[PDB]
Amino acid sequence: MRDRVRWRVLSLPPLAQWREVMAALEVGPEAALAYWHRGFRRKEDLDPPLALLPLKGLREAAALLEEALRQGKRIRVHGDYDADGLTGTAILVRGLAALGADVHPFIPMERVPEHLEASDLFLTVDCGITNHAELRELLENGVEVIVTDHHTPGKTPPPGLVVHPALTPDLKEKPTGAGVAFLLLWALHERLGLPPPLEYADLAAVGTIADVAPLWGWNRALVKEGLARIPASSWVGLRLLAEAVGYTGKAVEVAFRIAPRINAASRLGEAEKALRLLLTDDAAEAQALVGELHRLNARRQTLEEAMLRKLLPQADPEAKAIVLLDPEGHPGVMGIVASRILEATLRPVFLVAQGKGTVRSLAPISAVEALRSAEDLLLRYGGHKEAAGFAMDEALFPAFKARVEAYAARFPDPVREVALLDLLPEPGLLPQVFRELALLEPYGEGNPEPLFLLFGAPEEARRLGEGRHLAFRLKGVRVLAWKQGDLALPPEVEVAGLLSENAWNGHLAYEVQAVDLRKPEALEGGIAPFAYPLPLLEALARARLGEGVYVPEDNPEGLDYAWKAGFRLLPPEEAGLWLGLPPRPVLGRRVEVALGREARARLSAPPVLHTPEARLKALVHRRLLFAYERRHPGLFSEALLAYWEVNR
Ligand SMILES: [Mn+2]
Ligand SMILES: [Mn+2]
């Protein structure tokens, strides 16, 4: 919840690589650091090429589609009911229909009989990887089958043509159902000698974001293309839904405003509505359908809020596993209620309603593995490490509870990490830093928005209402935050926050939105320590007592006070106490380091003459000062190595 949150400072890269990214991407050291951690090291990683990924089975499926089209075979597109499944079938349904195909959708074994009666070619989107037995249409009545999906497969690929990323050896890419739908239509356009179907990238991007797929490589390229096309979409329904939610080109708006609206239709039993919104060219009908989705989303929200309100206060504590029963709960909203409970609790969550079950888990507790430990009690079940689902007779709930509660007790408590890119730059460099981080977008599963660490005594603190909302300043920068129940900041605070560009009344303000705030505590990070920060007062005392000490040539003023006081001056490689920094590395040491307060070495504190790699130096300096002051042997030692190098 709060005592199991670990803050860590990301490691510094080798200076030669840091400088290469800076030069190659034309950015300062802060953004360069972020790029490096995300794997962006060439100008080609920021704008990857949107190309036809060579998935296994893709050429064949496209060949089969050409045959279906030319011979006028009846194509049925069977997609999933969430955003990815719906955008994926809309892509294939619109795509194939534009080429003169006789095609129609079918939205979700007892169905196979009519699946047979209605089609010559059966296309599953975002599903069908594990539906073996239904090889019936392949067998029972000669129906051609194409499976496109990306979900966790089975022990063996199902009958029929199967196109799946995970079945493509080597391939690092992780396209989703809509991504695969999109690649397939593209493969077909290639066979027909037609241009890439880029007008379908917006639908594809919506599905990819909705499925929380990693946003790097091809997925990153697909999303930049689709996000950009939404405003003037070829699909009036998508455009109108984007406008209804005030879309401004952000992947985050799709993830939190557009897709949930599409998903609500499904969860509430009206998935046809969302699909039709994506297939219509009639603006009037689309407008009405957006209204309808807004109504379904409001209903889903109302039900989710009521359920959360009934559940969260229950069996939560420090239980190891939260397992609750709500007999009459709506199964269409419980997945999200379990996610929200998991977050306010850092515990796997298991919910059961109307005989249906959903699991959201984290840390070392595999969701599906907990269910496997109680499998005898279940009618159906399955999922992965983070989410899972099942069906079970509610009479068995108490037995199910103990089973999972004990499964979870086998593991150490889940712990949440907060990753910090670096210390926040000085107020004057925030605009440039913000503009350079800009290029990282779109943010998502692939690349999270970076967080900066602020530290100090809060000043000018002032509340906003009677709630936790409040604002203050740290060394000149305004930070906005929701004080976790308490209000009133301690004397000194540590903040993990997002660099924001806040527009108001035609003007901009560069501030920080705190994601976490807390009393200064141990920070994870740094290298195997060799230099240990010691306050100058303590160091001078020991020096006066006769400890073998080192004072660098620089600030002969300090070297004078030393000589002209009889210190047992020594060279850095043999003195276990240093009062300043040596010019070149001195490892295989294990020494205690002091800078000062009125000391000259403490001049990692003076402002530069920006722009070049002068900013690389200033970041290193600010790092040393911070690690020195926090008495953090690991970050100090790491900063000291970077310090030697940016001076060679
Ligand atoms: Mn799906
Ligand atoms: Mn999917």
Side-chain angles (χ1 to χ4, degrees):
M1 294 180 70
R2 39 72 236 305
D3 197 348
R4 290 176 281 127
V5 174
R6 247 56 95 182
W7 288 28
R8 171 182 306 271
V9 179
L10 304 188
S11 72
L12 298 175
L15 270 292
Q17 296 183 189
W18 202 334
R19 291 166 153 165
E20 285 168 0
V21 179
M22 283 196 277
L25 298 201
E26 296 192 67
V27 302
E30 297 78 13
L33 228 188
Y35 290 122
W36 196 77
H37 285 317
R38 307 301 161 68
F40 294 68
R41 305 178 60 169
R42 300 183 307 301
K43 202 118 180 170
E44 329 309 4
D45 295 66
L46 288 169
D47 250 276
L50 176 58
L52 170 59
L53 277 183
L55 311 170
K56 219 255 283 195
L58 195 64
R59 312 191 289 184
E60 186 184 327
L64 201 56
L65 284 169
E66 174 168 20
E67 286 309 294
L69 217 128
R70 186 169 57 81
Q71 308 183 213
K73 298 299 178 176
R74 183 133 170 175
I75 300 167
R76 169 172 284 220
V77 172
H78 179 101
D80 189 10
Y81 43 55
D82 59 1
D84 193 46
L86 301 186
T87 56
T89 106
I91 286 173
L92 289 174
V93 164
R94 276 179 182 283
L96 295 168
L99 304 169
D102 170 42
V103 61
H104 66 89
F106 177 77
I107 226 296
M109 243 291 239
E110 221 273 60
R111 233 90 188 214
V112 181
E114 64 191 58
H115 279 170
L116 179 286
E117 165 61 43
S119 65
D120 298 306
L121 179 61
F122 191 69
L123 264 160
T124 60
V125 177
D126 192 38
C127 77
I129 193 62
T130 124
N131 283 170
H132 296 270
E134 298 193 1
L135 80 168
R136 273 267 309 189
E137 38 203 7
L138 202 299
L139 177 161
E140 179 70 357
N141 201 290
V143 178
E144 284 285 358
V145 181
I146 304 181
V147 178
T148 72
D149 190 15
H150 68 123
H151 295 216
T152 296
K155 297 174 180 301
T156 168
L161 238 332
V162 66
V163 178
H164 199 304
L167 301 183
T168 299
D170 161 3
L171 192 76
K172 298 292 71 184
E173 313 294 0
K174 308 257 300 184
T176 60
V180 169
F182 179 79
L183 295 166
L184 177 56
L185 176 66
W186 187 340
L188 175 62
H189 276 215
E190 291 275 303
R191 285 187 67 89
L192 306 182
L194 294 171
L198 303 196
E199 49 174 346
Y200 295 84
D202 50 0
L203 289 170
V206 167
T208 305
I209 291 161
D211 251 19
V212 195
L215 305 194
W216 52 65
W218 192 83
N219 278 344
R220 183 145 187 291
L222 177 75
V223 166
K224 292 154 82 73
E225 189 63 40
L227 294 178
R229 304 175 78 99
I230 288 178
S233 181
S234 274
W235 330 122
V236 68
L238 177 54
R239 171 175 172 173
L240 243 37
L241 173 53
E243 292 177 354
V245 311
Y247 181 70
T248 64
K250 304 310 188 169
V252 80
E253 299 163 325
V254 170
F256 293 98
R257 301 177 165 156
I258 301 184
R261 251 75 155 184
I262 290 168
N263 285 328
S266 185
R267 301 169 190 288
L268 267 55
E270 303 182 26
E272 322 71 67
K273 244 64 96 72
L275 179 57
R276 178 66 195 156
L277 171 66
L278 298 178
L279 304 180
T280 192
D281 288 334
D282 184 329
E285 177 184 19
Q287 182 181 54
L289 287 165
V290 167
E292 198 88 319
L293 289 200
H294 284 153
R295 179 204 64 234
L296 289 151
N297 186 65
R299 174 59 165 162
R300 181 272 292 177
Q301 275 163 161
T302 303
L303 288 167
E304 176 188 314
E305 198 59 26
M307 184 174 282
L308 184 278
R309 201 182 164 73
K310 182 191 306 199
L311 273 40
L312 187 64
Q314 296 190 46
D316 276 52
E318 302 269 337
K320 265 60 170 169
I322 294 190
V323 195
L324 317 170
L325 174 69
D326 184 7
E328 297 311 301
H330 190 125
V333 309
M334 60 183 207
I336 283 159
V337 176
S339 289
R340 295 181 61 183
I341 288 178
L342 174 157
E343 227 54 275
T345 250
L346 277 10
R347 297 298 188 180
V349 176
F350 297 78
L351 266 32
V352 174
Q354 289 177 270
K356 305 303 159 67
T358 185
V359 188
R360 289 299 179 267
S361 183
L362 76 176
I365 303 169
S366 166
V368 73
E369 215 69 53
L371 294 189
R372 189 162 292 135
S373 84
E375 81 188 310
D376 55 303
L377 268 13
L378 324 170
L379 302 177
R380 307 149 205 154
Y381 87 95
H384 42 266
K385 298 191 187 300
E386 309 281 320
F390 59 107
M392 169 190 82
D393 186 302
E394 293 184 357
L396 294 173
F397 181 72
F400 173 72
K401 191 166 184 286
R403 198 63 65 74
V404 305
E405 301 200 308
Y407 174 77
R410 279 159 55 180
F411 305 76
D413 292 348
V415 72
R416 175 165 72 79
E417 194 182 85
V418 175
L420 296 319
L421 213 218
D422 184 21
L423 240 53
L424 182 72
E426 296 281 334
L429 295 290
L430 298 185
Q432 181 62 187
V433 170
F434 177 87
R435 296 189 298 265
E436 305 179 336
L437 292 176
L439 281 301
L440 269 167
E441 270 144 39
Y443 290 127
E445 192 57 16
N447 50 164
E449 189 162 8
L451 298 164
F452 288 95
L453 178 71
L454 287 66
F455 184 114
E459 63 182 86
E460 308 195 0
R462 47 169 148 66
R463 182 182 300 109
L464 297 167
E466 282 296 2
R468 289 85 160 52
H469 216 324
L470 66 77
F472 57 97
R473 312 188 81 78
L474 288 179
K475 308 302 171 69
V477 6
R478 188 164 89 127
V479 26
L480 280 144
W482 294 81
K483 180 65 179 66
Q484 322 286 169
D486 241 309
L487 283 139
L489 306 317
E492 281 203 353
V493 288
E494 255 168 6
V495 172
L498 307 162
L499 219 199
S500 305
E501 180 180 67
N502 293 330
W504 183 264
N505 176 53
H507 304 97
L508 315 170
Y510 290 91
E511 308 171 329
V512 173
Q513 187 75 50
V515 308
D516 195 13
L517 187 175
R518 76 174 181 176
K519 171 182 173 69
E521 289 179 16
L523 288 165
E524 286 177 284
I527 59 170
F530 77 82
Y532 298 63
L534 181 71
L536 185 68
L537 297 179
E538 271 177 59
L540 293 164
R542 285 162 60 168
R544 289 189 286 244
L545 255 23
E547 190 158 334
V549 292
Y550 161 89
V551 178
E553 326 310 345
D554 338 304
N555 185 203
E557 189 154 354
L559 188 60
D560 181 275
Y561 174 81
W563 267 320
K564 199 80 178 180
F567 287 176
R568 183 193 163 204
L569 269 324
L570 285 170
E573 63 289 342
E574 71 187 37
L577 176 58
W578 295 357
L579 288 179
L581 313 180
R584 283 162 274 97
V586 182
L587 315 187
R589 279 285 45 210
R590 203 295 182 182
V591 302
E592 283 186 86
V593 183
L595 297 181
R597 179 56 268 187
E598 291 83 359
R600 273 210 158 299
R602 191 181 186 78
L603 273 303
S604 317
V608 221
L609 325 173
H610 315 287
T611 161
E613 82 136 57
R615 287 207 280 152
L616 216 194
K617 182 201 278 187
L619 181 166
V620 175
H621 287 179
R622 175 212 324 148
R623 256 300 239 293
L624 279 177
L625 276 299
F626 174 79
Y628 177 73
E629 299 186 6
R630 248 65 284 160
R631 260 90 252 185
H632 194 293
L635 291 155
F636 189 70
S637 305
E638 178 188 51
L640 186 48
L641 298 185
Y643 175 91
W644 310 131
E645 206 62 340
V646 297
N647 295 342
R648 189 205 286 176

